[PDB]
Amino acid sequence: MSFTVVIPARYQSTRLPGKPLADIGGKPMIQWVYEQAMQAGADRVIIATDDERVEQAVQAFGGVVCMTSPNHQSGTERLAEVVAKMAIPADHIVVNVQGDEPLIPPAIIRQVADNLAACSAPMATLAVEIEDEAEVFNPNAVKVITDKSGYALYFSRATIPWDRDNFAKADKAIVQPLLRHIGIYAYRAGFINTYLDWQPSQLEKIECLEQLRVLWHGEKIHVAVALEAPPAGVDTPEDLEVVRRIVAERAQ
Amino acid sequence: MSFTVVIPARYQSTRLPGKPLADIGGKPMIQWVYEQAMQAGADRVIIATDDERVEQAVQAFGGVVCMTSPNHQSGTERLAEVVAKMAIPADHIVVNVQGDEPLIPPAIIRQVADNLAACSAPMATLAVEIEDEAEVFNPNAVKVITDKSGYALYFSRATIPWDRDNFAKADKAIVQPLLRHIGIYAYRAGFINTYLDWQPSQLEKIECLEQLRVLWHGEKIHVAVALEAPPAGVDTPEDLEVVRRIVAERA
Ligand code: NA
């Protein structure tokens, strides 16, 4: 089994402008993500960016970088262009890892690739078990449920499975965990064009969940519990200071 | 196409006791459902009951009765007993119609049987579009969403699909309908036993939705919008009088 990791780097942010290049212990944020991907055993790692500053910084650590169009609308159109420009074969496993995750556990990057290779779905993703009321009823925490083979039945901002008996109480009891989707995906490279070209579903627009396109078109997404729950993506100066502390402590 | 209709008619009811034998225009409620099933083109209609009062009454209008277990059974459990007891062949289509729907449109009984015959799936069912907030956010109203071919993705007591933008608002806006599942099923007779003997999912117990067992084992359930939206069933005395006046309005 071999797989390639593609990491989109988004330069623009009102809270952390130039985020991919934020210095963390002497390396830009994007380099840390790159290096987590290498530690996962990826045969190849590719930063996708539309900003020349990112290109230059990645070249300066010897990283592979693919320049993509500034006019893309979704991170799937972006991934599609990398697959085309870098000539990635249709059967090759690609893992999409967000460029704002410098502390992503390498084991889960490998996990999602391994899961895709082992199953009959063209796409694989992961979830974390949740049981705190905060996230269980939080529409920003996307819930997912699976069949006996691990294929997703549905993803939703609604609280799925609804516990009829325990959620009626008004003092809503949580007696078993739910599964919260995490934003890491593995695809057969050729499937990315299939996904891209499929007629958009109404479901995906109502829920604001792109992956519902796949379900609506009758195709499968494998889902597994992540081996280790990943830290949240870095969005603010406060989040960045937390990562700087963790990274500094990794040298102590 | 040929199908059999099985109509469960439990006498005991907390909301309306002895309901299958509640009078409507001179006939017990059960007789009205039976007559609607006959109008649908059913090869055969079977009333499934565990009470001999229902048995006597159905035989008195000339209906076929199958006696089922007087112990607590689930929906599938009851239906599987009839299928097993009368040795219904595995490839025969069985439509399960509730004994408390005296005004069920014969056309939708035929629809669910037709839909099942038109595909390879072991199971078919129906839904109605809903927009009323009291139904949309009610866990007693089971929601369903389908793929592009009409196969169920999930059934839930949660409000699905969640409209991110519109349901965040203090007064939630319903800008497209949802689908409410209605309790009419068609199955391949043999599938019913498989369904019965399958390893149970956790999902089915949490949501209290038996049909999630099927989705968990990865088998398909086809779902279509009812060709005619059924009238309300009968759960309470109030509901009964609604039917009584509908029938009275005809004469
Ligand atoms: Na340390």
Q: Is A162 within 8 Å of chain B by CB?
A: yes
CA distance linking residue A18 with residue A53, whole number of Å: 9
B161 C-alpha to center of ligand 1: Å?
45
Give residue B85's identity as a one-letter amino acid code.
K
Half-sphere exposure of A162 (CA within 13 A, CB side): 23
Q: What angle do CA A39, A44, A46 make, to 5 degrees?
A: 100
Q: Collect all residues with Cβ–Cβ distance below 8 Å to B163 and sequence separation of at least 6.
A: A206, A207, B172, B173, B174, B175, B176
| C-alpha distance from B136 to closest chain A C-alpha (Å) | 12
User: Strand A23-24 and strand A27-28: pairing?
Assistant: antiparallel
| C-alpha distance from B219 to closest chain A C-alpha (Å) | 10
Query: Could you say which of B148, B158, B167 has the minimum Cβ distance to residue A160?
Result: B158
- Resolution in angstroms comes to 1.8
- Residues A201-214 as b/e (b if ≥16 CB within 10 A, e otherwise) read bebbbbbebbbbbb
Contact between residue A128 and residue A40 where contact means Cβ atoms under 8 Å apart: no
| C-alpha distance from B58 to closest chain A C-alpha (Å) | 36
Q: How many CB atoms lie within 10 A of CB B217?
A: 16
Handedness of CA A204, A210, A216, A220 (dihedral sign): negative
Number of residues written out for chain A:
252
A109 C-alpha to center of ligand 1: Å?
23
- Chain A residues 186-215 with CB within 8 Å of chain B: 201-203, 206-208, 212, 215
Strand, coil or helix: B163: coil
B41: burial class by Cβ within 10 Å (0-12, 13-18, 19+)? middle
Count how many domains chain B has: 1
B247: burial class by Cβ within 10 Å (0-12, 13-18, 19+)? middle
User: Which residues on adjacent β-strands are paired with residue B37?
Assistant: none
Contact between residue B121 and residue B186 where contact means Cβ atoms under 8 Å apart: no
> Widest CA span of chain A, in angstroms?
58
Q: What angle do CA B225, B131, B164 make, to 5 degrees?
A: 105
- Residues B70-91 as b/e (b if ≥16 CB within 10 A, e otherwise) read eeebeebbbbbbbbeeeebeee
Contact between residue A42 and residue A5 where contact means Cβ atoms under 8 Å apart: yes
Contact between residue B76 and residue B195 where contact means Cβ atoms under 8 Å apart: yes
Number of residues written out for chain B:
251
Contact between residue B193 and residue B139 where contact means Cβ atoms under 8 Å apart: no
Contact between residue B103 and residue B84 where contact means Cβ atoms under 8 Å apart: no
CA distance linking residue B103 with residue B113, whole number of Å: 18
Q: Is A173 within 8 Å of chain B by CB?
A: no
CATH number of the domain residue A224 falls in: 3.90.550.10
| C-alpha distance from A133 to closest chain B C-alpha (Å) | 16
Are A153 and B151 inside 8 Å of each other by CB?
no
CA distance linking residue B158 with residue A183, whole number of Å: 23
Q: For the packed helices A52-60 and A29-39, what is the interaxial angle rounded to 10 degrees?
A: 50
Which domain does A3 fall in, by range? 1-252
Using an 8 Å CB-CB cutoff, list chain B residues near A162.
139, 156-158, 206-207
Q: How many CB atoms lie within 10 A of CB A121?
A: 23
Among A126, A102, A129, smallest CA distance to A115 is for A126
Q: How many CB atoms lie within 10 A of CB A74?
A: 10
Contact between residue A79 and residue A8 where contact means Cβ atoms under 8 Å apart: yes
Contact between residue A207 and residue A155 where contact means Cβ atoms under 8 Å apart: yes
Q: Collect all residues with Cβ–Cβ distance below 8 Å to A169 and sequence separation of at least 6.
A: none
Q: Is A137 within 8 Å of chain B by CB?
A: no
CA distance linking residue A131 with residue B34, whole number of Å: 47
Strand, coil or helix: B179: strand
In DSSP notation, B106-144 reads HHHHHHHHHHHHTSS-SEEEEEEEE--HHHHT-TTS-EE
Among B40, B32, B41, B19, smallest CA distance to B250 is for B32
Contact between residue A128 and residue A184 where contact means Cβ atoms under 8 Å apart: no
